């Protein structure tokens, strides 16, 4: 009933330290006052790491140039999923780190992560040698490893998308959903889950497998989710766990970004699920 | 930046005290070891209140007779939603109190509640004079009122059900879902949300409005959810907040229970949403 | 088993808010890295209140002038008692607020307080209408009132001083101590308590009564404790609770400060105990 | 900024597990309701370990025989130092384990420990191969090792006793105290510390060194502290750390107990300090 503690490691080190320190602060603070507050906590923790030169934030129009300067670029969403504060659904924080220099392909990521503020604050992190899952130990004030080299199932049994947009679906989404509900091979239909908070839905996709979609649709031809600080980081994590992440027409990490608040479609998860979605597009 | 504390009140009092004490213990402990553990914490907290005579638990075949005896009956589900432990989705605890004497109509409830183990542990409670929402303050070890007399919206804009069971839907569910996605009156389609944990989905239904369904279907003609300790308590809370709860053919609280682990269909939420569902059945 | 919360009140308001916010941060962080850290947390919380113009800190040679400027002066000791970090003895934080303008008599204090970092973080605060005791509720992140208008006993039964300095005592300390151990009126001797951390010893003096001494001695003719940010604040709190605080030759709050790091002797507590000490000096 | 956890080990194992589980509960609960409550938590945690046959508690007249029976005896004080609840001084819990069978010499201890409820809950534990110090991590609900094989200084510079009992001192205490205040070898006098809570004073003695005394005196010829569940356990811990513990006339661990609530004098700490005290007795 007793434990020993040991330091763990995956300038980059100091940067992640400070990004984790901001996440701890965000955790405890979990209204748009909250967005404003989360934003400043990340920007000032990150600047003071002396590890950054450029930040892109979901809450700022323009890139933020550090005075304190280091070699890394960070694109982040400091608080995502806030339309769910009341229902205690888990909101999250998303970040990707690079060496504008924030308009690089996701291919170039050196580190990325998300935090999920649930009954425990969980962080998925990767530095390019797999995904590790941590939980925040608020007593210690430190992140404790819970799962090393997390791998996603080859094929799952859950599909995750807002089916209330059915009337707006493109033809490949319509087909794919039809296949999940009415399998043509004698298998049982997939179950459906959709929390409405991207980090909560992605995290479930990692740990139980299956597929998550926020595809193009009639109302939103480029999707809703943001390339630099939502889609690229989760595509990186999911790919490091053995999954796939596509826009429908190319890998998310291969998209050349055209603007820092650019949106793209996002389909990710277990690889054989994503590949079946892609087969619906090719038609 | 400073506060004062005052005691709040809605034998019954001692019983709720002990039910709240079990919820605190359950909270902190959030594998079927966990189910076993939650079960014993509730049974022994409840027996020692000296306020009970009969308990029905989701985890026990037979009713449990208290040796210590008082005037109240309690039907409870000590831990619901466990298929979601990993994805940090909020699991819950559900209870209803009555004065077998556990086979009474929901109409006879004297008190009911749920707890939702999210980033905060929230409890919805009613003693028949509305719904109050509390949060667990683990420092104090006590529940703090956050919202008095919670009211549900007359009509919402979210529908909540596993649409992966489409191939098994009865005709009224098929129609209703079709209406939410393809409104015939020029309105925008409803959004869809489904966490897959009944307390998390019901709680969202209370606080944002709309509708939650686990109706009859081809695989499960009596639904999945359990009348005594899942459906009746949430129907009571939702009705105390101004909503409705139906099996499709009658109010949940009016169903005469035939066995303590009986299942029924469950459709609840904003009243005009439920009434529109009922209009799909009458056809 | 349930509670309601209500806001409590004693520019000044914003200042105390920020001083309380620094105390929360200090609490959690409880090595001289820690001193450095506590210092910056107070200085930057206090500056940003936009309520200050001058700060005196135990850790800074010179007064710190705020750029952000308001009407209040604050003398503080951000972390006192650190020679006791290991033995879990409670360390503290001490502050006094005024309207150099930090060289005012204690008579001029508008507010003062201490925090004691024990199993709970306790704050004694006064704004000149008595003393209120609060505990930090780290869940809420807020201070909860536990005792209103705290009054110290007229006479206690504990005396508190480092008796290992006996060989250095001045004659009045020698006499007083002799009286506590060998009462000449048939009463039992006082008990002795000395934690070696000024805030822990003062706090015990408030809540149980008796007397606390760090008098002049041969090694230290002006005592050890610092007038601006140790002695004046605790003299203010203790006097607001009905006690007395003397240097041996005058009330602490009447001493005209000659330098911001000036030391003075300190004898405080229950009034009849202090008056008996003063009777030993007059001889 | 990240950590990994590993299980640590020093029927005996299950017993310590349950003793640690009681300490966690006691911690959080920190009035004699509290004594009653702490007592029951230990007795019922300990019985259910299925590792015990006999318990001696400070709060029970008679030994408690377990129905559930195992090979170990436990003498404990579930809550000590309660006259200090207000002043946040650390109260503690003390226990010793043996294989009446509770009237054994301290020499026979198989394990012993104390917990100190300060800003962190600390446990000193030994199973006969030195002392290890742990802190309670309430988030994890588990004890984390902070210091392995703790050793006490050969000689310290603090002496700890209620000097308000001077008029009642026996001649050897009078002499020893005189030596600490007026060293005859040109050295500086020792400093004095006395919190008035035995576990807080013993713990300081371990971690900073020096000496702690609750000797015989005129009012109390057998001292105050209790042999089975106060004096023997701390003598065991202190001796495992390289110190000494004497009654003045023999080692505490060598005293043959005559009754389960027997008192003895207690002088412990750094060995050269204890030996100097013993030199004052031999005269």
Walkthrough of the structure:
Chains A, B, C, D: Pathway: Carbohydrate biosynthesis; gluconeogenesis. Chains A, B, C, D: It comes from Homo sapiens (Human). 4 copies of one chain form a homotetramer. Chain A is α+β, with helices and mostly antiparallel strands and 283 residues long. In chain A, 29% of the residues lie in helices and 26% in strands. Chain A has 2 domains: 1-150, 2-Layer Sandwich (Fructose-1,6-Bisphosphatase, Chain A, domain 1), CATH 3.30.540; 151-283, D-Maltodextrin-Binding Protein, domain 2 (3-Layer(aba) Sandwich), CATH 3.40.190.80. In chain A, a hairpin with a 5-residue loop joins strand 7 (121-126) and strand 8 (132-137). In chain A, helix 3 crosses helix 6 (271-281). Chain A is globular. The interface between A and B is large, with 37 and 37 residues.
Q: What's the number of helices of chain A?
A: 6
Write the CATH homologous superfamily of the largest domain in chain A: Fructose-1,6-Bisphosphatase, subunit A, domain 1
Q: Give the SSE order of chain A as H and E letters.
A: EHHEEEEEEEEEHEHEHEEH
Based on the coordinates given, report the CATH architecture of the largest domain in chain A. 2-Layer Sandwich
**CATH topology-level name of the largest domain in chain A:** Fructose-1,6-Bisphosphatase, Chain A, domain 1
């Amino acid at each position: 009933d007793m434990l020993t503690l040991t330091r763990y490691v995956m300038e980059l080190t100091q940067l992640l330290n400070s990004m984790l320190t901001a996440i701890k602060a965000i955790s405890s603070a979990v209204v748009k006052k909250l967005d404003v507050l989360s934003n400043s906590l990340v920007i000032n923790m990150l600047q003071s790491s002396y590890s950054t030169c450029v930040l892109v934030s979901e809450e700022n129009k323009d890139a933020i140039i550090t005075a304190k300067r280091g070699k890394y670029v960070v694109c982040f969403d400091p608080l995502d999923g806030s339309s769910n504060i009341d229902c205690l659904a888990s909101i999250g924080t998303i970040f990707a780190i690079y060496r504008k220099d924030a308009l690089q392909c996701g291919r170039n990521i050196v580190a990325a992560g998300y935090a999920l503020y649930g009954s425990a604050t969980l962080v998925a992190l990767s530095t390019g040698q797999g995904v590790d899952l941590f939980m925040l130990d608020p007593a210690l004030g430190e992140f404790v490893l819970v799962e090393k080299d997390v791998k996603i199932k080859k094929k799952g049994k859950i599909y995750s998308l807002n089916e209330g947009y059915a009337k707006y679906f493109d033809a490949a989404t319509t087909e794919y959903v039809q296949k999940k509900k009415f399998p043509e091979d004698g298998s049982a239909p997939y179950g459906a889950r959709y929390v409405g908070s991207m980090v909560a839905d992605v995290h479930r996709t990692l740990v139980y497998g299956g597929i998550f979609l926020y595809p193009a649709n009639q109302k939103s031809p480029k999707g809703k989710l943001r390339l630099l600080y939502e889609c690229n980081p989760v595509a990186y994590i999911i790919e490091q766990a053995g999954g796939l992440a596509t826009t429908g027409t190319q890998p998310v990490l291969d998209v050349k970004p055209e603007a820092i608040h650019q949106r793209v479609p996002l389909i990710l998860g277990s690889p054989e699920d994503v590949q079946e979605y892609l087969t619906c597009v090719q038609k």
